[PDB]
Design a protein around this nucleic acid. Structure first.
Ligand SMILES: [Cl-]
Length: 346
RNA sequence: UGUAAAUA
């Protein structure tokens, strides 16, 4: 019998087992649930640079088979950790040619994320040079998008310019990624970490289809990030768009969170535009804020206004709403909506 | 009364 068949059987019986014992059993150990945990635990606890080195040549020699294995990916990742800097360059060479595929596989993409998190900028660029080949598809992929986010988080803005030019590659790309469950995460990291020279065209595309993106189930988080990481002028354009279409934005499922985001990250004069629009009445119709309290989404927006605005702005809200308390008690959940605001009406 | 990611 081979070493692992023996070891899996009576594990206590082999408590005095070491990494250099494995020698050429490393592939079978790494791909094994018990064997993988032995390797991992040995690497974490060993104080012997040479035990750890002993298995490394097997790891490099079998890298393609281990990176997308359910257990083996943990063994490869151990050599991408701080403490193993001496092996980073070798291990990246072992996998560089198949990074375009590994980005898409659920286990190997974790090896790529671990490498980006730990290794130095020359090696990061080397990995990104392969991601460059598949970057659009990778951005939308359930595994690949985490790899692209990790790139944006851990690499200097200038070396993810190719990612920004992919967002900008065509007219509809940023709409396409913003309304995608995975690509929207990439747009967000970009908004958090790319330089103003890079974010300004991205935010420019977003603006062009703002309404559509704002009420998308993924796009609405993309515009929330624009509010939080964009410029004063971006916030002004958005608050102005939202103020002028307050009722439409407030009564839709997804855009209603955009108004709330404006109310949290908005300056006193932004809240003033949204409060002013809310208390402006038509000639016979009721004020927008009253209509909003009767709505399934917009009533949460009205309550966020009371939590976020100045006493003076709350005053105008209170003066606008109080003549309507009778009516608003009838409407669905109206009972609860005004109890939550009762604090303000006493 | 209302929203979002791939490992033992
Ligand atoms: Cl998969």
């Amino acid at each position: 019998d081979d070493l692992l068949t023996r070891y899996r059987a009576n594990p206590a019986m082999m408590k005095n087992l070491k990494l250099s014992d494995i020698r050429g059993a490393l592939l079978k150990f790494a791909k094994d649930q018990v064997g993988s945990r032995f390797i991992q635990q040995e690497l974490a606890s060993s104080k012997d640079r040479f035990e750890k080195d002993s298995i490394f040549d097997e790891v490099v020699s079998n890298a393609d088979e281990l990176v997308d294995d359910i257990f083996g990916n943990y063994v490869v990742q151990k050599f991408f950790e701080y403490g193993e800097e001496r092996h980073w360059a070798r291990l990246v060479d072992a996998i560089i040619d198949r990074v375009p595929e590994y980005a898409f596989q659920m286990y190997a993409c974790r090896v790529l994320q671990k490498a980006l998190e730990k290794i130095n900028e020359p090696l990061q660029i080397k990995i990104l040079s392969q991601i460059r080949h598949v970057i659009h598809r990778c951005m939308k992929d359930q595994n690949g998008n985490h790899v692209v986010q990790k790139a944006i988080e851990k690499v200097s803005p200038q070396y993810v310019q190719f990612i920004v030019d992919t967002l900008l590659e065509s007219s509809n790309t940023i709409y396409e990624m913003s309304v995608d469950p995975y690509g929207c995460r990439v747009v967000q990291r970009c908004l958090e970490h790319c330089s103003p020279s890079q974010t300004k065209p991205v935010i420019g595309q977003i603006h062009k289809r703002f309404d559509e993106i704002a009420n998308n189930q993924y796009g609405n988080y993309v515009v929330q990030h624009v509010i939080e990481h964009g410029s004063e002028e971006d916030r002004m354009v958005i608050v102005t768009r939202v103020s002028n279409n307050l009722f439409e934005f407030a009564t839709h499922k997804y855009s209603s969170n955009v108004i709330e985001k404006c109310l949290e990250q908005g300056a006193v004069y932004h809240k003033s535009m949204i409060v002013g629009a809310a208390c402006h009445h038509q000639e016979g119709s009721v004020p927008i804020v009253v209509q909003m309290m009767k709505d399934q989404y917009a009533n949460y927006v009205v309550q966020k206004m009371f939590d976020q605005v100045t006493s003076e702005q709350r005053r105008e809200l209170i003066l606008t709403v109080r003549p309507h308390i009778p009516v608003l008690r009838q409407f669905p959940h109206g009972k609860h909506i005004l109890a939550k605001l009762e604090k303000y009406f006493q």
